[PDB]
């Protein structure tokens, strides 16, 4: 029942209730002739919603807000982007125009600026050193260290034991490294072990792309990263 590219037209978004007051959002983008899904998170914050990551671009993100509006019917007041790439900040300007307060670390804002990407308005302090965690409403934000990108954050919903790994965590189906241009391969496994150490109780692990699972996604990702590191 988890939505795949199958159930999702180009320019459309599906929501998936993972737990009470926690959903993933699923969108698709065409890239180099293939079609790849992407996940973000939606977390109920009393009578409002906290959004984790855009739906990979302005059109998808306007569909996401319409689909939230239609299916949950609570306002999105804040959004956090988990790193600087376009599947995470692309659509920020849409969210901003809808009155959503957009947030990212200074590290992510700096990198999004160097990249010419959209730049979330608000700064998330206290995440600059590996292993930093800060509370953000119904979630904890964690900086595990450099992995998929130097700035990548992970998100934990303590009430539902939902860990959103973002692009630092691969789905089981992904058996080779994806985009690693901005990755720190030497630190990625160490950063994953920081996630392991910090959230050993997590019950649902949502990767940046694809199928949810459990904490076996962290080891899976370690395996894939090391295999890549050892390419000859
Ligand atoms: O900080 C903000 O921009 C903001 N957004 C929605 S309510 C509020 N304050
Ligand atoms: O890993 C990711 O988080 C990722 N996010 C968007 S795309 C991609 N991975 S990707 O398909 O392998 C790629 C991107 C850009 C250029 C080539 C390949
Ligand atoms: Zn990325
Ligand atoms: Zn990605």
What do you see in this structure?
47% of the residues are buried. β3 and β4 form a beta hairpin. The chain has 232 residues and is an alpha/beta fold. It is globular and about 50 Å long. It has a single domain, classed as Ribonuclease Z/Hydroxyacylglutathione hydrolase-like (Metallo-beta-lactamase, Chain A, 4-Layer Sandwich), CATH 3.60.15. The longest helix has 14 residues. It binds 5-(phenylsulfonylamino)-1,3-thiazole-4-carboxylic acid (2 copies) and zinc ion (2 copies). It is classed as hydrolase. Keywords: zinc-dependent hydrolase, PFam00753.
**CATH class (first level) name:** Alpha Beta
Radius of gyration: 16 Å
| Ligand catalogue | 5-(phenylsulfonylamino)-1,3-thiazole-4-carboxylic acid, zinc ion
Proportion of residues in helical segments: 25-40%
Strand arrangement, largest sheet? 1-2-3-4-5-6-7
Shape: globular
Beta-strand fraction estimate:
25-35%
Terminal CA distance reads: 39 Å
**What series of H and E elements makes up the topology?**
EEEEHEHHEHEEEEEHEH
The helix count comes to 6
Q: Biggest β-sheet: count, sense, barrel?
A: 7 strands, mixed
Q: What is the total tally of β strands?
A: 12
SS-derived structural category: alpha/beta
By CATH, the topology is Metallo-beta-lactamase, Chain A
CATH superfamily: Ribonuclease Z/Hydroxyacylglutathione hydrolase-like
Known CATH architecture: 4-Layer Sandwich
Query: How many structural domains can be distinguished in the coordinates?
Result: 1
Family: Belongs to the metallo-beta-lactamase superfamily. Class-B beta-lactamase family.
Protein name: beta-lactamase
Catalytic activity: a beta-lactam + H2O = a substituted beta-amino acid
Organism: Pseudomonas aeruginosa
């Amino acid at each position: 029942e988890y939505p795949t590219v199958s159930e999702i037209p180009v320019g459309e978004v599906r929501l998936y209730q993972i737990a009470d007051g926690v959903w993933s959002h699923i969108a698709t983008q065409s890239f180099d002739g293939a079609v790849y899904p992407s996940n973000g998170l939606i977390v109920r914050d009393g009578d409002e919603l906290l959004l984790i990551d855009t739906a990979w671009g302005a059109k998808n993100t306007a569909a996401l807000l319409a689909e939230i509006e239609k299916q949950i019917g609570l306002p999105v007041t804040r959004a956090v982007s988990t790193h600087f790439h376009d599947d995470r900040v692309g659509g920020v300007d849409v969210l901003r125009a809808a009155g959503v307060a957009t947030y990212a670390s200074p590290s992510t804002r700096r990198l999004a600026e160097v990249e010419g990407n959209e730049i979330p308005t608000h700064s998330l302090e206290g995440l600059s050193s590996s292993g930093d965690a800060v509370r953000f409403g119904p979630v904890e934000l964690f900086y595990p260290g450099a992995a998929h990108s130097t700035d990548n954050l992970v998100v934990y919903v303590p009430s539902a034991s939902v860990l959103y790994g973002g692009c630092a965590i691969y789905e089981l189906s992904r058996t080779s490294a994806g985009n690693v241009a901005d990755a720190d391969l030497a630190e990625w496994p160490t950063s994953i072990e920081r996630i392991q150490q910090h959230y050993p109780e997590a019950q649902f692990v949502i990767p940046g792309h694809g199928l949810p699972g459990g904490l076996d996604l962290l080891k899976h990702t370690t395996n894939v990263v090391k295999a890549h590191t050892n390419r000859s």
